[PDB]
């Protein structure tokens, strides 16, 4: 399996990396119906969602969608630096596929 | 897909963003019959909740509506500054849509 | 829907407000046979617990239970004022409905 | 209902209260099949399980057992004094039924 | 049933413990689409996954897998140390079986 996220990343078509490490700056998240959704920003500004669960995604995505958002959320409030972000770039804002926490 | 809140709200009919810059007042919930429900207080005295999950909402929307109770809590324990609340106005209190969260 | 506890508490019967300002002294929860609860009490003895799971409560019910109870936690955890607890006083000890936290 | 864990210890066949007034100072867990279980240590080196899921346990333990193993991690890595320990002594190591912090 | 992690990792084949008596250096985890998973690192560059839920896995290692992903995040979070983990070293990188927390 993948030693890291980057190795993970290079699995998957439409995917890159984006190398941050820092804190993450704002934290959304939405309950309104379809767009259940998070969205993070860094001081920066590059912005970054985790998507609306739907038809691209397996049934084994569902509950790690809803694992990255609890993430997302402890991490923005405990200031943790985010190292790198793996994305798919098909989408805008970049959708999240993986993270990586280091200090 | 929205790139901010303000975006996101724009979305819908009946919202409205309030700007808070400021952490959450007080917290409350309930577990009685018909009002499983939080409501939030500001300084100013905004007060906000998140509906009871009803007909209005689609199943999407249910895991998003646990989520942000969640959220709810540990901003307000941790003292989180909350920047915007996206909210339906065809409610009273308000209803809660969506939260940002910048320092 | 409510704007406060208080007020939410006097739509239902057999309830009581308890205006506590405190931190939670002692937090029990049991895993044990038709007791998986919660009790909490107060320096100035007061005892409060979260029922059982019931024929009494709607199926609505059950998810908010067990947000209670992680409410309460993490409340005893990080030393969190309890401002109120709306009750239900029909019960020995009384059973909790709603806790409101400022200050 | 019980207003303590020693009242409600004694509600029940092959307990007893270990008093620890001390917080944890080991918190193991595992995923291995068969052995999904908790296991924690006191500094004086008593040291308890939270069972496996088992036959033995009712529907409305399942949700309590989960719980409970979320209480000891937290309790653990917050250093929070465990006051009491409800358990059932016809285990090794003994098996948590209940919990209780103060102090 | 056994009382340390040591006594656990004894009872399954392909399977060592590894000392750290460290905290987390890197946490990583993943929501895309067969790599549901989480790798963690320690400063003497040992690497370590949670692997994603197969068919070599029984019904009941599933909420665990689930609870040890909870349990890295939140131990990398704190800076807790890990003192041990068992893991099987028939895959790799080594796949986390269990895990030890202690001062
Ligand atoms: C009802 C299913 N039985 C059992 C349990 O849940 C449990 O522990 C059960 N049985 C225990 C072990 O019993 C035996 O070893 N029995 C076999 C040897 C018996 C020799 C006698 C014999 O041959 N009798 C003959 O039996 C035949 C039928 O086979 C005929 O009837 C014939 O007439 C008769 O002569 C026994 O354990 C107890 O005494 N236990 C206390 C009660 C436990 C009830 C459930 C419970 O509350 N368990 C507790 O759960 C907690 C979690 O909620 C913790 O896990 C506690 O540790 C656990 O006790
Ligand atoms: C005996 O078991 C039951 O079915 N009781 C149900 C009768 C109808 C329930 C009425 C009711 O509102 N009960 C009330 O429920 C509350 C929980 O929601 C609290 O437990 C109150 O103490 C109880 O009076
Ligand atoms: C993790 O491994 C296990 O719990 N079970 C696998 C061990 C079984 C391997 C050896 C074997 O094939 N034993 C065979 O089991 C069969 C049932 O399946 C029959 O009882 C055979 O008589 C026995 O020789
Ligand atoms: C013994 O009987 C069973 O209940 N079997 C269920 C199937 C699993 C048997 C094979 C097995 O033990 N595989 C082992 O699974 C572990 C996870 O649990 C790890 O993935 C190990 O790398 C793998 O060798
Ligand atoms: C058939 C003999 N037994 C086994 C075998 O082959 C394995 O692998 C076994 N069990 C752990």
Same mark, same amino acid.
């Given at each position: 399996?993948?030693?890291? =996220? ?10 890159? &990396? ?5 804190? =993450? ?5 939405? $309950? ?6 998070? &969205? =993070? ?32 959320? @402890? ?9 790198? $972000? ?8 970049? !959708? @999240?596929? !993986? =993270?990586?926490?280091?200090?």
């Amino acid at each position: 399996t993948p030693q890291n =996220i980057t190795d993970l990343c290079a699995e998957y078509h439409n995917t890159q &990396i984006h190398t941050l490490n820092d804190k =993450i700056f704002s934290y959304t998240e939405s $309950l309104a119906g379809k767009r259940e959704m998070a &969205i =993070i920003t860094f001081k920066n500004g590059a912005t970054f969602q985790v998507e609306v669960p739907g038809s691209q995604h397996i049934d084994s995505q569902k509950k790690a969608i809803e694992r990255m958002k609890d993430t997302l959320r @402890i991490a923005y409030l405990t200031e943790a630096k985010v190292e790198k $972000l793996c994305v798919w770039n098909n989408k805008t804002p970049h !959708a @999240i596929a !993986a =993270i990586s926490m280091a200090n």
